[PDB]
Design a binder for this molecule. Sequence first.
Ligand SMILES: C[S@@+](CC[C@H](N)C(=O)[O-])C[C@H]1O[C@@H](n2cnc3c(N)ncnc32)[C@H](O)[C@@H]1O
Ligand SMILES: C[S@@+](CC[C@H](N)C(=O)[O-])C[C@H]1O[C@@H](n2cnc3c(N)ncnc32)[C@H](O)[C@@H]1O
Ligand SMILES: O=c1ccc2n[nH]c(C3CC3)c2n1-c1ccc(OC(F)F)cc1
Ligand SMILES: O=c1ccc2n[nH]c(C3CC3)c2n1-c1ccc(OC(F)F)cc1
Lengths: 380, 380
Amino acid sequence: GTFLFTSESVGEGHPDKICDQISDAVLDAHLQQDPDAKVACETVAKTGMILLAGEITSRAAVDYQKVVREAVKHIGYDDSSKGFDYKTCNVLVALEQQSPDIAQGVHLDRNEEDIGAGDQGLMFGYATDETEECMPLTIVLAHKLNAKLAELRRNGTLPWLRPDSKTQVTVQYMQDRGAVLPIRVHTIVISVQHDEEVCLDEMRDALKEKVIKAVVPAKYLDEDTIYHLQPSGRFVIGGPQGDAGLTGRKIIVDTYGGWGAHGGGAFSGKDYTKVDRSAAYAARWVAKSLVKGGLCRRVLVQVSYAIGVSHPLSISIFHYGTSQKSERELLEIVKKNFDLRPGVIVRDLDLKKPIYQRTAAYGHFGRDSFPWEVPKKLKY
Amino acid sequence: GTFLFTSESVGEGHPDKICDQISDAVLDAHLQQDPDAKVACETVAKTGMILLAGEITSRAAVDYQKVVREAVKHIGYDDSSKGFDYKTCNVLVALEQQSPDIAQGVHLDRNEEDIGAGDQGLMFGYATDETEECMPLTIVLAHKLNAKLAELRRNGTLPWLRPDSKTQVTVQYMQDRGAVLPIRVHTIVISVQHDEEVCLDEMRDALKEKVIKAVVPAKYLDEDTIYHLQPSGRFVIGGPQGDAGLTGRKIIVDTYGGWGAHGGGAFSGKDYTKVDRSAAYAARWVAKSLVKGGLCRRVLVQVSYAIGVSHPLSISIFHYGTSQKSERELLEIVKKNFDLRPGVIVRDLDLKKPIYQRTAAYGHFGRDSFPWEVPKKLKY
Ligand SMILES: C[S@@+](CC[C@H](N)C(=O)[O-])C[C@H]1O[C@@H](n2cnc3c(N)ncnc32)[C@H](O)[C@@H]1O
Ligand SMILES: C[S@@+](CC[C@H](N)C(=O)[O-])C[C@H]1O[C@@H](n2cnc3c(N)ncnc32)[C@H](O)[C@@H]1O
Ligand SMILES: O=c1ccc2n[nH]c(C3CC3)c2n1-c1ccc(OC(F)F)cc1
Ligand SMILES: O=c1ccc2n[nH]c(C3CC3)c2n1-c1ccc(OC(F)F)cc1
C-alpha cells in the first residue's frame, strides 16, 4: 500500500524563475496603467543579460529598464561577486504589438464576457485533502525549503547564501481509498549557490540544522531519511551565469510538483485572455471547491479551448475513487456553479489586478488566499 | 463509464518547436564530432531572430550560422512573404562553456558508468496498450494531423499552407478495468498559418477533406463530432513573427499529451548527462517494456535524481489497476532488468548518437523505433 513520490522546487534566483518573475513584473506594470493590456512577455536570462521577447498591445507607458532592474534587485542579484547585478546587466527589448490576426480573432469588437480564448490548449486543476491548503506535501515542503533559504539570506543569518537554489523532496505515502496519506520524508536534496569563503561542511551542517529542521516537522524525519546537501560539492557560479533561464520552464514547480496533470502552458507574462493561465487558475479553483465542499478528497479537472471560442471544448473530472458522486454528477455540479469562459473567469478571479509578480515564485497554488484559492460555496 | 480527454500537438514551424529543432540540430552538430560534448543549448525565436543561449563544452568546431539556417530551411521558412527566412534572419550566439562547478560535480574524473546526474529532478515514463505504439490516441492523432499539413505543404497539394500549425483532439473513452478504450473523436481543432490569397471556406473544406479525413479513421467520426477549423478566422502572420518561441515550451506535446505525468524538464538541446532527457527516455523504455511484456495494460514510472549522484533517489510504478502484480513486484522486476544510472542509460539507449533533431517534432515517443521504443525482453 505504500509508495514514493518526489517533487522539486526552485528559489527566486533560479534563472528560469528570474524570467517568470520579470515577465510578471512587466505584466503588472502594464496592468497598473491599462487593465485591458494584451501581454505575452517572454524573458531569457544568461550571463549579464535579460532579454524581453514577445508581444504587448497596451495604452501603458512602461519603462522596461526600470521594471526589469527592480525585479532583479528584489531577487537579490546586486553585485558582480554574486554573478549578476541589476545595476549593470544588459536589458534588451524585442517587443512588438500583438498580431492583428490574433487580436481580430480573439477580442476585437467582442463583448467582454464573450471574448474568445486567446489560444487553443488544455489545462488541469488539482486538489488533495492531504494538507489544509489542498496541495501535495512533497511540493509544499520543497517550496518552503527554498523560502527558508531566501529568508536566511535576507536576514543575514547565512550571509554566504546566494539567490539561486533548488530543492527536492521524496515522501513515502500510504494509499487510503483513493486519497493519499504522507508517512515520512524519504529523501531531501538541497543545492544553493554560495560565496567563495564558506566550506562544504559548514554549508551541510547549516542546511540540515537551520533549513531542514526549521521547515520539515520532526515526525517526518527519521534514521533512514537520506540527505543530499550540496551534492555537487561546489556551487559558486550560479544564476544566469551558471545556466540560461527562460520564462515557462518551471511549469511543474509552478503547479503541483508532478501530481495531478499538466497541459503544457506556462503562466508568467500573460494577461487573462491567455487561457494557459486563467483557465488553469479557474480549474484549480473548481478542484479546491470540490474538495473543500466535501464532495471529494482528491480531484483532477481538465478543460480545453479553441482560439477565438469562448466556451471550453471539453470538461472532465476524475475523483480517484474519493467521491460518492459519479463524474457525470460532478460535471453537472460544476456546470451549475462555474462559467469557464475567459471573459467570466476574469470577473470571478479579478484577473486584471496587478498581483502576478507575487505568483511567480513558490508556486501559483496553495498560498496567500489568491481568488482561485478561496473556495466557492457550491449549490446543488 | 465514459469520459473525455483532450491533447494537442504543433507543427514543425510552430515557434516553440522551431527552437526545439534548432537546439537539437546544435546538439547533433556537436555529437557528430565529439560524442562526449556537454551541451545545454536554449533557443529563442522572435521576428527575424534566432538567439542561442546556454553552455557548451566540446572539442567540435561548429558553424552555428550554418547549423541554425539549415534547420530553419528544413522547416520551410525561406521567404519574407512567409514571415521568416533562413537566408536573411539574424542569428545571435550567447554560448559559454559549461560551468566548471557543474563539470567537477557531475563528470570530471568520473568513470563513465558512475557519472553523476547532470542535475536533480523528477521524470516520468508512460505506456498504454490502446495503440500498437503504446501511446494515447489523442496525442497520436494530434501529431499525425500536423504531419499531414507538412506533407501537403511540401508536396504542393495545398500551396497556401505555411509551416506554423497547431492541432487539438478530444476523444471520448470508455474505462476498462484501469485501461482506456477510445470510442470516438468528440472535437478537432486545426489552426494553420496561410497565405494572403486563400479564402477561409477553401481552407476549412481542405482541412476537413484533405487533412482530417486522410488521418482520422471514419469509424471515430460521426454526426456529432465538432470541428473548429481555422477558428481564429485569419492566420497570415505566423511563426516567430506571430509569437515568440523558446526551447522546452512544448514538453506535454513532446511526451504524452497530458496523459501519464511530467516532471517539468525539457528535452531539446541537452546531452545524455542531463537526466531530464535521458531518464525520461529510459522511463518510457521501462514503461513500454512492462506493457509489451504483458505485465500491465497501462503504466506510469517515476524516477528522480540528485545532481552529482549516479543512482536514482526514488523509483515508483503505478499500474492503474491493470496488472496482477503489486508495485513492489513490478519494482523488483525493473531492478533486475534495468540500470537507471545515466552512465548506463547512455550505453543501453546509444545516447551519444546524433539523432536528436529527429526527435524534436511530432513527439519523442511512439515513433520510428528509437532505442527507447524497442522493448527490453524481461527476465523474472
Ligand atoms: C545544473 S544546471 C543545468 C545544466 C547546465 N545547463 C549545464 O550546462 O550542465 C540547472 C540548475 O541547477 C543549479 N545549479 C547550477 N550550478 C550548480 C552547481 N554547481 N551545483 C548544483 N546545482 C547547480 C541552478 O539552479 C541551475 O539553474
Ligand atoms: C495564439 S499565439 C499565443 C498568444 C500570443 N503570444 C499573443 O500575443 O496573443 C500561440 C500560437 O498560436 C498560433 N497562432 C498564431 N497566430 C495565430 C492566429 N492568427 N490564429 C490562430 N493561431 C495562431 C501559433 O502557433 C502561435 O505560436
Ligand atoms: O496514486 C498512486 C498510488 C501509488 C503509486 N505508486 N507510484 C505512483 C506514481 C508514479 C509515482 C503512485 N500513485 C500516483 C499516481 C499518479 C499520480 O499523479 C501523477 F503522477 F500522475 C500520483 C501518484
Ligand atoms: O482515467 C480516467 C478515467 C476517467 C476520467 N475522467 N477525467 C479524467 C481526466 C481529467 C481528464 C479521467 N481519467 C484520467 C485520469 C488521469 C489521467 O492522466 C493524467 F491526466 F493525470 C488521464 C485520464
